[PDB]
Amino acid sequence: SYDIQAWKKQCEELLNLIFQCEDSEPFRQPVDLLEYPDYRDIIDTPMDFATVRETLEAGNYESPMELCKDVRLIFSNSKAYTPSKRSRIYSMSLRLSAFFEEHISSVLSDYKSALRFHKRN
Numbered sequence: 001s002y003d004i005q006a007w008k009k010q011c012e013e014l015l016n017l018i019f020q021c022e023d024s025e026p027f028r029q030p031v032d033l034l035e036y037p038d039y040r041d042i043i044d045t046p047m048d049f050a051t052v053r054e055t056l057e058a059g060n061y062e063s064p065m066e067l068c069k070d071v072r073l074i075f076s077n078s079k080a081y082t083p084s085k086r087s088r089i090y091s092m093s094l095r096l097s098a099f100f101e102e103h104i105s106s107v108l109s110d111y112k113s114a115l116r117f118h119k120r121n
């Protein structure tokens with residue numbers, strides 16, 4: 001499996017699966033500061049799955065590792081903002097994180113293998 005570009009379509013399909021998940025609902029758009037007045041006191045770099053998709057679709061990721069960094073920021077921002085480890089929105093983040101890591105591991109492995117094969121000589 002030595003296609004250096006295959007990660008992009010794989011990431012588009014995994015973002016489609018995440019957008020079908022009810023658990024992604026809170027993570028698909030920005031936080032309204034009228035609903036959460038303190039959100040930006042706590043979170044200095046916001047991130048959501050619409051921004052991740054639009055970055056991928058614009059050709060502004062060079063590797064799946066960069067996409068993976070931004071998706072992990074979505075989840076770390078949820079862990080930082082939550083006032084309880086058993087909040088509804090934080091608990092949704094943890095299930096979605098487990099699904100994302102399960103699916104992204106082959107994408108990263110295949111990309112890194114493909115690049116190694118490219119630089120074999």
Ligand SMILES: Cc1ccc(C(=O)N2CCN(C(=O)NCc3cccs3)CC2)o1
Pocket residue numbers: 025026027028029030031032035036077078079081082083087089090
């Ligand atoms: C209470 C708590 C603990 C952890 C979080 C959290 O990670 N937030 C704040 C709330 N967020 C938000 O308002 N997203 C927009 C939408 C919500 C539902 C449909 S659109 C997402 C990010 O919030």
